Ligand binder design. Structure first.
Ligand SMILES: Cc1cc2c(cc1C1(c3ccc(C(=O)O)cn3)CC1)C(C)(C)CCC2(C)C
Ligand SMILES: Cc1cc2c(cc1C1(c3ccc(C(=O)O)cn3)CC1)C(C)(C)CCC2(C)C
Lengths: 210, 8, 224, 20
């Protein structure tokens, strides 16, 4: 059993444009570890398994945290450092194409359906409890845990949005979007450090580190 | 690594 | 739920493009990469026929049918042969009827992604006993991807996609009422299918640009 | 400009883009 509130408790308890974006992400990774330890049963896993899930997941877990929090601002992103990055700001830094992907595939669909925080935290716990991640000492423990989240998400969506029967499936069907933009964000960060013209701080660099 | 491992 | 997007029509389209038993017979009783790419090219012609048979696809603007197929061919094509291989041990059945064992893929130096297909798609399709109606429904959702860059009416495509997964959900708890989580974990295979399609395109781009694998004309068009 | 896909997408029972 993982109650959906404790998941809401976890989301709540932690709260050149590209240089500011990467700085915003570096300090959210410190945040990310403290959130995960708040997800029920996560700290029960083998520690190396905990490591694997976070290194496999961090990329999409951060995208989904700032996408949801940017539903208030229009045509822009609200960074964790309090700064707003408008679309034009990003376009004339040269990251326009992927910045728009986030705007049209995630924040707008988040806004347009009014996805709430509880639902956000469940999707983040689904992304965290990823059973196909290489090298887990027991992917079926993780899998059982992913089954507890999606069960606790369906029951939530129907008790509270009974007039929206397709809502729970609408949530799950943005996860392919989150994975596809997770990967292009990574292609970008490796290209940034290849070029060497973009400062990268020590926790973010470690996540890029092999 | 050292950071993520340490924090956990 | 089933009235305008009926599971029975999507099953019909799936069955209509199933390969013949004979072909597996005549082929199992060139190099693997070239043999896979030749198969894939063949299925591309077939994928179109399959799309015209999906309720309402023919209604979308021609530009949007084009965008939807170019945006999802690879994922669609990988979905077909994964479920087609669900009773095969450590290998895939090609649309030409030829079997490719993972040891052939490893030999040819493409085993890692081949094993991803067997571990993340095929094997889980087996553990579940995913049927062809569910396969057709998951495929219909890939086709009806409203995120596809360039779409002229993404809202209509999202409507078509909502239609499918309302009918898919209804089928599942009708046929499998003792398995409540079954609808969810059917949908959770799509992120996996997304990464593998991406990885698969990386290989094809490599083969086209730097490689020597001959590429037939429709598959080559799909990589332009 | 995608000539294969275009040519394969035509048919008799449906119009190029007019739709209800
Ligand atoms: C580092 C990083 C870089 C980028 C992005 C996301 C991040 C990440 C992140 C995490 C958290 C926050 C925040 O809350 O402020 C912001 N960003 C990795 C998640 C997107 C996808 C916006 C496209 C542009 C670039 C510059 C490539
Ligand atoms: C072209 C292609 C190449 C490859 C694969 C898949 C395809 C595709 C495909 C399509 C259709 C069929 C079929 O059913 O006949 C088979 N394959 C793109 C889908 C995988 C990932 C299996 C292994 C690695 C290589 C050899 C690079």
């Amino acid at each position: 059993d993982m109650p959906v509130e404790r998941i809401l408790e976890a989301e709540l308890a932690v709260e050149d444009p590209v240089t500011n974006i990467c700085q915003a992400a570096d300090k959210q990774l410190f945040t990310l570890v403290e959130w995960a330890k708040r997800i029920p049963h996560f700290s029960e896993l083998p520690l190396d398994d905990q490591v694997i899930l976070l290194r496999a997941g961090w990329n999409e877990l951060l995208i989904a945290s700032f996408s949801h929090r940017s539903i208030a601002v229009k045509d822009g992103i609200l960074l964790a450092t309090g700064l707003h990055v408008h679309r034009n700001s990003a376009h004339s830094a040269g990251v326009g194409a992927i910045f728009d992907r986030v705007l049209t595939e995630l924040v707008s669909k988040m806004r347009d359906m009014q996805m709430d925080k509880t639902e956000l935290g469940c999707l983040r716990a689904i992304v965290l409890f990823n059973p196909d991640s290489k090298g887990l000492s027991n992917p079926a423990e993780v899998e059982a845990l992913r089954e507890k989240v999606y069960a606790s998400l369906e029951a939530y969506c129907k008790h509270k949005y009974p007039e929206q029967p397709g809502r729970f499936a609408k949530l799950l069907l943005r996860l392919p979007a989150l994975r596809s933009i997770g990967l292009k964000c990574l292609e970008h960060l490796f290209f940034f450090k290849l070029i060497g013209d973009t400062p990268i701080d020590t926790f973010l660099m470690e996540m890029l580190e092999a | 690594h050292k950071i993520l491992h340490r924090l956990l």
